[PDB]
Every structure is written in structure tokens, then in C-alpha cells.
Design an enzyme around this catalytic site. Structure first.
Site, mmCIF file in Angstrom:
data_model
loop_
_atom_site.group_PDB
_atom_site.id
_atom_site.type_symbol
_atom_site.label_atom_id
_atom_site.label_comp_id
_atom_site.label_asym_id
_atom_site.label_seq_id
_atom_site.Cartn_x
_atom_site.Cartn_y
_atom_site.Cartn_z
ATOM 1 N N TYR A 62 38.987 -76.196 -18.717
ATOM 2 C CA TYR A 62 38.421 -75.038 -18.034
ATOM 3 C C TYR A 62 36.910 -75.101 -18.031
ATOM 4 O O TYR A 62 36.238 -74.942 -16.975
ATOM 5 C CB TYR A 62 38.823 -73.792 -18.747
ATOM 6 C CG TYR A 62 38.336 -72.518 -18.091
ATOM 7 C CD1 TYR A 62 38.846 -72.115 -16.915
ATOM 8 C CD2 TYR A 62 37.387 -71.734 -18.725
ATOM 9 C CE1 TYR A 62 38.402 -70.934 -16.338
ATOM 10 C CE2 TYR A 62 36.911 -70.567 -18.167
ATOM 11 C CZ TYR A 62 37.439 -70.171 -16.966
ATOM 12 O OH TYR A 62 36.931 -68.994 -16.374
ATOM 13 N N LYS A 119 34.137 -75.216 -14.942
ATOM 14 C CA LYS A 119 33.066 -74.238 -14.706
ATOM 15 C C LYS A 119 31.684 -74.842 -14.753
ATOM 16 O O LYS A 119 30.812 -74.483 -13.991
ATOM 17 C CB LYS A 119 33.242 -73.064 -15.618
ATOM 18 C CG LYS A 119 34.540 -72.282 -15.352
ATOM 19 C CD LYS A 119 34.699 -71.844 -13.903
ATOM 20 C CE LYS A 119 35.787 -70.806 -13.624
ATOM 21 N NZ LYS A 119 35.711 -70.398 -12.186
ATOM 22 N N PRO A 130 30.969 -64.366 -16.198
ATOM 23 C CA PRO A 130 31.462 -63.343 -17.123
ATOM 24 C C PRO A 130 31.759 -63.841 -18.511
ATOM 25 O O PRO A 130 31.919 -65.048 -18.693
ATOM 26 C CB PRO A 130 32.757 -62.867 -16.460
ATOM 27 C CG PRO A 130 32.694 -63.334 -15.043
ATOM 28 C CD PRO A 130 31.889 -64.624 -15.105
ATOM 29 N N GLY A 131 31.871 -62.888 -19.425
ATOM 30 C CA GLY A 131 32.286 -63.110 -20.800
ATOM 31 C C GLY A 131 33.763 -62.853 -20.966
ATOM 32 O O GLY A 131 34.637 -63.482 -20.283
ATOM 33 N N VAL A 165 36.605 -60.758 -20.412
ATOM 34 C CA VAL A 165 37.082 -59.661 -19.567
ATOM 35 C C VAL A 165 38.453 -59.147 -20.044
ATOM 36 O O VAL A 165 39.415 -59.886 -19.990
ATOM 37 C CB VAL A 165 37.119 -60.069 -18.095
ATOM 38 C CG1 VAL A 165 37.414 -58.851 -17.215
ATOM 39 C CG2 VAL A 165 35.783 -60.643 -17.709
#
Lengths: 259, 259, 259, 259
Positions: free
Chosen positions: A155, A159, A185-186, A188
Site C-alpha cells: 500500500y 501511495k 489522510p491519516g 480515518v
């Protein structure tokens, strides 16, 4: 009403962050192209957009299919009369130690998270260049696009690659008046993190529930992120007040990764 | 003689940077496993290693084939009696504007540059964990793994992904006593850059020769990089003096990217 | 609308970027505390704020005076009935080669650009904490706080320092409900760059024109930044759409520095 | 061997990391200029250098005194017949919450850690340039020069500043044949972290033990750093295997900060 007269397309729009983004952009004035993989859930989100007073087009699409993405996005843009903002939000997560990642697994996550972003940038940039539109491309990145995390190697790799693509595309598309940025984002707060924790536990021997709790304990601001938190920053990136920002991959993460 | 009694494996070892690395590690004391795709050029490099007084094993391998890499590396390690250092050097470059990248093209560069690094980390880490070896994994990254460059979007995406993998693997493999770092070269003076310039010219309309010259003009130190420049830092990363360094992706680039 | 009911303080508010920031925050709803060094030009800016139907306090202050900044800010916050947002905008620039920087010179710029930011952070967080408010501290950083620029050694050092203090403060103040972020503009004024370009040629033997091309014509978007560009992003950072963002130093630079 | 014929200067050389650096550079062949604040402990360290068959000059100096540092370094370089390597190692640490940092406190640490580095850079580059030597400037940075740490606001600000000056200096001095890099250690001493951990609980309401776990037990390699770890990397940066490396601030930190 930042986005009056604008048209925005959002991938993964039927639920979660993509849905929040779609609704926020619609509230700020935009008509919305909603792309996802299940027609019935897409149709529901489309009705909520239409309830806010906007036009919606809701189409199934596979972001990993280059030519179909291009044609489907073009169909939707023709229906609404344009395209000004492309939000490449959809992606998937995997959890697997570095030593155990398999070939089909890693091909799958790259096909969705990297190729899918690329194909959406290409589909949208093609349309922008047709009318001379000063378009905006906005990609979903992550804290994992700034730092590689354990058990999230695949992942994180995708990113980081999206960040690369953001930069190279910002530099190449600037002369066409198109900006390219990402949001990062962190944690979520979702049932998704409950699933991550479960897997992480079986891999390591920690207690179920412990890993998700420990991650939340790490966030400086002391609370988990909402989909609306992410949408608020995507709304900024969609607006005139972001015209001079390009190439950036900006953390909205509650104080997890500091750049 | 930092590497006395050590065994190092190097991919892309028959020429260029990988060959320079192989020879430098052999000079510092290591026996060398040379992996590449053409037996006849590999055999020549093997003889130069043996001329420096070391043992060499030279085997063709496809770094993108997970299971074959694992078995071939294991065969070579058995022949020499161990493995202490793995240098995942081999990779390929592409030149193509963001808008024109095609599916087979991007699948190919990810298969070699990302999967191939991953498969080599896995192959080497498996062997290290067998004897409790405090092993070193050293990956080839690039200035393009720190910043995305125009016309190099696919390549940059793969080098960002290698940086991610470096970080996640450093964190996960530390408890096995294995460090993972990357080296990031700048403009390494080769016929390769003449090819890059040619392509870049046809894409853009600049004059043949102009783009390579302009890139060299950008390097703070005022000279191009040699393969031995890269090898010197790989030699540091292979040594005891790098024991406490892990997770890092270090620029040896003449002053192009500043971190 | 966006800042209805809020009170913001802005240093360097009489002219320039700080005046743009002040006027934008007022347009968005905030009453404003205007802090600068010349009463007559502060008074003019206060009158522009008042013409919007907003309240303004305009007071002279030296940001490098810790205790005076504390008391003057507190005096103004009392007059207006609170304080929600602190923008530490004011700073100075210097152009000098690394070798030629003198003791009084470097002390001056650190006094203003680093101590002045710290004293503002302290003055505002003292107020937020004593009242219990969830406040926002927003510091002026720069492209030069992310990368060191030639002839801008001292300035770059101060801006890097500002980014450090942003991150430490974000970590320490999060549990009081206070966020700390920085905004990092690119190139607004061009005259300084002509100067820098000339002086670079004299001190390093670069060609005249070549530094200005590298930095000023290196902006991806192809135009210099305006004060409104900067103020737009500061307005985002003042808003509830930045609630979850802390510890960040975000580039709005037209595509010059890529992170 | 590696530094045969070279002359190096090291600040903070009497004890600690600086003494380790000095002794390693001597073992590698370099005569050494030892600079520190106490003659008696400098003399002891000089005797250890001399026992290796190396030449040593040991002189007291205040790194924050620009002109004195210039003349003392020049005096020593004359005694030994040159100067090739300058290591700006000496610095101080402070532990204080952002809100409590006082004017004399912050001025002191900037005087030593930022001005002191700058004055050393100036003293050595003046010598290298007046003689024409291709010299190496090596500055002490830190994990805290890459990320701001709680209770280490002032120290982090100084180390970020050091990284800025490394980058500006690298860009300005490259055309004189001088490289400038920094080394960034992690956690060597643990007592400071107990202090920081306690004080973090008092000022933010963190649990006792929790900050020490985060930072000290967060080191991937699972052990604190030694002075020899640091000196090993400084030896690389002093060597011809770092010739092509400039402008870099490299982490040797056991896996704490990932770039």
C-alpha cells in the site's frame, strides 16, 4: 459558493471518503460525476447530490481500464457540458508482511491504486486540453505515501508512486493551465480499521483490538479523522484559493507525519 | 578490508553500475554472486572478480520472477557458503510524457523495478533468516525517487515505490538483524543519457544534445557521476560502518536534490 | 461567512502580504488585531478593515520583544473580546553569501524571524490556554524553509527554524486544542532575484541571467505569486476546514519545491 | 589508509562523540586539530592521537566567536601544513517546553549551535579557498534537524537551521571544490529522554513512560547509538568515497526518522 458553474468527477463516490467529497463539492456549487463499481449504491449517492440542488451523473467504471475510463468520463462530461475538477479518490488497501507479498497481490494493488490514478489523470487532462480549461487534478495519497509502514509495504509503495505521479504530472501539465495535487489522510475512523486490526493481529499475535487502539493513541490531536475532515481539504484544493498550489501532497492527518 | 569473509550478490552485475559495485565489493574482500540476463557478458565480469582474487558465481536470472530469483540466489549462496549482502541494482528506464504512458509499458517498468526489488529483498531475507545472519539489503533508487521529473513519470513512480519498500522492509526486518537502505544516484555519465536526450528531443522539439547538456549544467559539483562514485557509497553501505543506518535512501548526486 | 464571530491577529499587517491576509480574514468575518511598526500606515489599514463593518485594533509592536508582544496582544484581545487565530507573518529577508555573513547581521534576522515567531506563538497560546479556546497558530515559512537557497543562507536557516518550531509546537499544544501550521510562499517580488543572480555570478562564477532563470523562470505555473495567492491559503488555514491539519508547512509556490 | 596525508579539524574534540570522531580520523591517517573549551582534557585527547603516530594540535576556542575561530583554526593549519576536513561537531542541548523558552536561553543555543557552525564553515572555507584545496565541511545535525521533537523546540530549530546552512553552503561552495554535508545521529544518551518523558506528562497530560517508549523504544534496531556509530559515518564523509556527495544531511539513527 466557490464551485458555482463547475463540474467535478469523483472516483469511489458511492461511499466513504469519495461520497463525502462528492457531497461537499455539490454543497459548494458543483455538478458531480460519480464513478464507482456498484450501480445501486451509486444511484443512492446521486439522489443525495440531486437533493442538494445539483446535477449528478452516476456511472460504473473500472479505474484500472484505461480506455473505458477515458470513454466513460468523456460521456459524463458531454452529458453535463464540461469538466473542471477530477478527484482520483478510489483505491484499495492490503495488509501483508514484506516477506509474504505475492505476485498477483502486488499486481492487483498497483493496477488499482497506481494505474487507476494515472488513467484518471489522462482521461481528465485530455478533456481539459480540448476546451483550454484550467483544470484541477486531485489525487488520493496517504500518510503511507510519505512514510513506509510495517505490514503496509504494498500500500505504501502505491501511495509513494501516486506522489511521484502527482509531481511529474504537475510539472508537465502546468503549461496547459492544469494543477495536480494530492491529499494525504491519516487514520480515518471506519469499520475498515477494524478489519486492518484483525489481520494485523493474526499476523503478529497481538490482541484483537489492540493495534487499532494503539494507532489512535498516536494521533497528536487525540481523535480519529472523519470523511468530512478529508472533504474539507479537497474542497480547498478544488477552489480558486488553490490556483497557485501545484505538485503538493498535503497531510491532513491530525499530527501523525510532519513535513 | 571491510568485507573479508563476506558474500555479496549484485543484480545487473555484468555492466555499468552493477559491474562497478561487484568489482568494488570484491576489492574490499567479498566473494560475489553476479546476476544478470546474458551469460557471456556475466562470464567476463566473473573473470575480473576472480582476477582480483575472489570467488565468483555468475548466473542468469529474471529479477521479476519471484520463485526463480529465490531458487537461483539460494543455489549461488549454497555454492559459496552463505550470503551477507544483497544489492538490488538492476532496473530499467523509460521516457514518456504522463499523458502517453500505456498499460503494457507501465506494467513492464513496475515488474522490473518494483517487483524485482521486492523479490530480491525476499530471496535474500529468507536466506539471512536461515542462519541468523545480520544481513544487509541495499536497493538502487535515484534522484527520481525523491522528486518526480518530467517525461520520467513512470520511472519516478517506480523509484518512489522502491523508497517505500526500503522503509517498510527496514522496519519489519530490523528484529531479524537485517538493515535495508537505498542509494540514489544523479546523472551517471553513459551512452544511456545520449539515448534519453534523443527521445526527449523528439518528444519536445528541442535540439538533439541540448537536454543532456542542460541537465549536466544543473549539477552543483560541475561534473557527471561515475559508476565508481556510486560504488564507493555502496561499499560504505555494505560495511560495518553502516550497521546503525537503516531505512534511509541517500543521495550521492553531485548536488541535484537536497534533503 | 467562514470566520464569522472569530478574532484574528496578524503581524506585519500594515502593508504587503500581511495586509492582504488581514483584509481577507476580515472579508471572511473576523475582527482583526493589526500589529506592525508604524502607526500611520497601521491606521490606514485599520480604516480599510473598519469599512467592511469589522472591528480592528491597530497597535505598534516589536515582535522580537517577548514580554511586550505578550502584553500588547493581550490588551488587544481584551478590547475585542477574545482571540481565535494568530498569524505570525512579519519577517525580514537578507541577501548575503555564506562566507560574508556577519555576527550582528545573523543575530538580527534570527531575532526577528525566529524569536519573533516564537514570541508570537507564546503570546497567543498563553491567551488560548488561559481562556480555554481551541486556537490556531499560523506561521510564515517559505520555499527557503524547505530547501537552502544560494545567497539566502541566513534567511533559509531562519525559515527552516520556523518549520522546526511549528512541528514542536504542534506536538506540545495539540492536547490543549491548539493547532500549529505554516504557509510557505514561493517567489512574490522579483528584484531580490536579480540581485541574487548578479551576486551569484560574482561569487561562484555562474553566468549572469542563469540563477534568475533557474529560480524565477523555474516556477512550473510560469508566473510569480501575488499577495492574494498567499492570503487565500492563510484563509483556508484559519478556517474550520483546517481543523484536523496540524504540524504542517504547506507550499503554495506555483510548483517550485515538491514534497 | 583512507585519510593518508590529510589534516582534519574537529570541534568538541576533548570528549564524547567529538573525541571518537577525532580518534577515528587519526586511525584512518589524518593529523588532527582538536578544538574544545578545556585545555586539560584537550591535552589528554591529543596524547591519544599522538600515540598513534599522528600529529595533533590542541587549542581552546569558542566556536561562537567568528574572528577568534578564524585565527585559531588558521594558526593550527599553519602548524600542520594544511587543512582538508572540517568537522563542526560541538553543540549544546536544552530541554524546555515551547511556552517556557526564554530570550537568553534561545540566544545561547543559537549562538553555539547555529553561529558556531557558520563560523566554522567560514573559517575552514577561507583556508581551503586561499590555498585552493578541495576541502570537506561536515556539520553535526540530528534526527531533530529533520523533525521537531516535543520539549526540544529550541534544539530542533537550531538543527533545522544547520541543515539549511549545509544546503546553502553546498550550493555556494561547490564551484570552489568544497563539499558540505551533515551527519544526523539519533538517540545516544537516554537520561535526557527520561527528563523529557516526565516533563511531557506534566505539560501535555501524557502518561509517564509513554514518551520514552515512543522515541527510545521506537528505534527500529532496538538499541541506542554509540559514539563509534557516529564516528564511522563521519569517517565515510571524510573519505574520497564521499567526493560526489554534497548538500546532504544523512541519518544514522537506527531507524527513527525515515527520508
Amino acid at each position: 459558493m466557490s464551485l458555482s458553474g463547475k463540474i467535478a468527477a469523483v472516483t469511489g463516490a458511492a461511499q466513504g471518503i469519495g461520497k463525502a467529497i462528492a457531497l461537499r463539492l455539490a454543497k459548494d456549487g458543483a455538478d458531480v460525476i460519480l464513478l464507482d463499481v456498484k450501480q445501486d449504491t451509486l444511484a443512492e449517492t446521486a439522489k443525495e447530490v440531486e437533493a442538494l440542488g445539483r446535477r449528478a451523473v452516476a456511472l460504473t467504471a473500472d479505474i484500472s481500464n484505461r480506455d473505458q475510463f477515458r470513454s466513460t468520463l468523456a460521456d459524463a462530461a458531454k452529458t453535463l457540458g464540461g469538466l473542471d475538477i477530477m478527484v482520483n479518490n478510489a483505491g484499495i488497501c492490503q495488509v501483508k508482511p514484506i516477506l509474504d507479498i505475492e505476485p498477483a497481490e502486488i499486481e492487483k494493488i498497483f493496477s488499482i491504486n497506481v494505474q487507476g490514478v494515472l488513467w484518471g489523470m489522462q482521461a481528465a487532462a485530455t478533456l481539459f486540453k480540448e476546451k483550454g480549461t484550467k483544470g484541477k487534478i486531485i489525487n488520493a495519497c496517504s500518510i503511507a505515501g510519505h512514510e513506509g509502514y510495517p505490514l503496509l509495504g504494498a500500500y505504501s509503495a502505491t501511495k509513494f508512486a501516486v506522489r511521484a505521479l502527482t509531481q511529474s504530472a504537475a510539472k508537465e501539465l502546468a503549461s496547459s493551465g492544469i494543477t495536480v495535487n494530492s491529499y494525504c489522510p491519516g487514520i480515518v475512523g471506519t469499520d475498515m480499521w477494524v478489519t486492518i486490526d484483525k489481520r494485523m493481529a493474526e499476523i503478529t499475535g497481538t490482541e484483537i483490538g489492540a493495534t487499532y487502539k494503539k494507532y489512535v493513541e498516536g494521533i497528536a490531536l487525540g481523535r480519529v479523522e472523519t470523511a468530512d475532515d478529508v472533504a474539507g481539504f479537497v474542497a480547498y484544493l478544488s477552489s480558486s484559493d488553490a490556483d497557485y498550489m501545484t505538485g503538493q501532497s498535503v497531510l491532513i492527518d491530525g499530527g501523525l507525519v510532519f513535513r
